[PDB]
Amino acid sequence: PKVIENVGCPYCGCSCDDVRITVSDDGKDILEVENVCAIGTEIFKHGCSKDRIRLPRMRQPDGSMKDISYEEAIDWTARHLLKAKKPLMYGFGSTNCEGQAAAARVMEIAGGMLDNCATICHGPSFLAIFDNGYPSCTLGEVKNRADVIVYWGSNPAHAHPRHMSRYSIFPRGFFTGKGQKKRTVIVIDPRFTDTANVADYHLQVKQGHDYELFNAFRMVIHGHGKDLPDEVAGIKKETILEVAEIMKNARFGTTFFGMGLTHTDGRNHNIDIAISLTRDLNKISKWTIMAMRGHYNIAGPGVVWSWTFGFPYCLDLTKQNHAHMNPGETSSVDMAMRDEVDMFINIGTDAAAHFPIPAVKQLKKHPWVTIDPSINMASEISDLHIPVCICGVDVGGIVYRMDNVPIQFRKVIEPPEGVMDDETLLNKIADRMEELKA
């Protein structure tokens, strides 16, 4: 019955911080959680569990898995990181920004490849940002000004549940006092998703033809739109002209994109034609692209490694004094394919589940270490499983929202007696490696 305000929900890009927890009398049981979506409710319900991992656990010859002390696990990982020739550390989607700084230091000492879930998720988007730029905005800007909203290839209803009710559509802002009723929502994707149910338009496009769709829109905008064919990407020219007229007349627009663009043919060229469209629309209106980042602090590795090495992802830290970045050559999946690794470290992700199984097969040839709070597929095919605190429930810190706005997450439960957090763990690994004098 000790109600705690302003907590952070640590799952989706929304980084919602309007969460209220009613912690038990002893400060270690969560009773009721208000204002959060279900996916979040379950995160907190799992964090407040009574039967949770407390010590590392090693793979014995028999194939079972027995516990070891933290110092022994740190010794194991340090010795292996030094003995290896090009270790790969992957993850960082779900960690505080101190967890993504400590890891950068550890792999600076080691000399391996450091990488995050950007490669497999919105890294194709960054590659377009490198090409064309990122005309964007914070989310309060679309809350308080947006007149048109476009969800191109995204599905907020199931990806980011309270995105619509917090930032985009339903809130009544300052210059949008009328709320939804003066917002025009356009949703583009081949399915008739729940976002399209809520929407007012829908451009059911053939899966994979978004490049042709964007080119049609941009010819319309550039002015001689009469040269369009009868239909484009399955969309009909009159509907194209309708949506384009709405976009032109928008007082302040905003485009959101997701897997529909970053996981189909022409991974980054879809995103950069979208960005070109936004830059073209800002000739006569105000339009701001914006990427639907997935995990809470998945924009955290981007900024932290931007300030540390200058490169958001796919870091080639093997020269030990100059880093390199080329996603086609230094990314986790391509290196796993070309068996270019020597050790895989699972930190803040589920590589076993969410990688292609050929890549997982290629990777498991080498040692495999997992730093997770709870059991998952990586912790089931790893060699040792080091527990760690959960961001936002057992430990606080900074996280980075969809739009690179830092939210400060709070602590609601003390972690089980013995369990440390990743910044302490990565720092101890780095200290032990320097002790081993490499």
Binding site: I120, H263, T264, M337, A353, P356
Partner: protein, 131 residues
């Protein structure tokens, strides 16, 4: 028959993973095909029956249902997870983003065959399936 395919999200799927990747909720949420009613009739797939989704980079036995989110004739959909990534092709096009949406696949109605659990799928792909 060529039957283009995508792999995407669902709230029940997110809920399931945060219950736990090894839970009955996760099994129920992810082992799912959400295809079109016209395609189900034309192929010969009984609603709520196992089916063999076999692409060039694998194979998986997955329950076949119909989804509210109306897939147009010629589209498939698995909620992302163990089962979908058993069949996702690894081609990246030198970008690091595998072909997670938009790969061809053939669908074969194969009832009377069980579904493979998440642990069984992954630990057997690696060669660790003790149980």
């Amino acid at each position: 028959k060529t039957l283009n395919m995508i792999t995407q999200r669902a709230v029940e799927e997110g809920i399931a993973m945060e219950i736990g990747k090894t839970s009955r909720q996760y099994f129920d949420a992810c082992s799912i095909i959400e295809m079109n009613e016209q395609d189900m009739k034309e192929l010969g797939i009984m609603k709520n029956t196992n089916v063999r989704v076999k692409s060039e980079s694998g194979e998986v036995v997955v329950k076949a249902v119909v989804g509210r989110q109306t897939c147009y004739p010629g589209l498939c959909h698995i909620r992302q997870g163990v089962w979908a990534n058993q069949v996702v092709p690894p081609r990246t096009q030198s970008t690091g983003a595998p072909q997670y949406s938009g790969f061809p696949v053939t669908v074969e109605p194969v009832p009377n065959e069980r579904l493979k659990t998440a642990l069984e799928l992954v630990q057997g792909a690696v060669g660790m399936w003790k149980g």
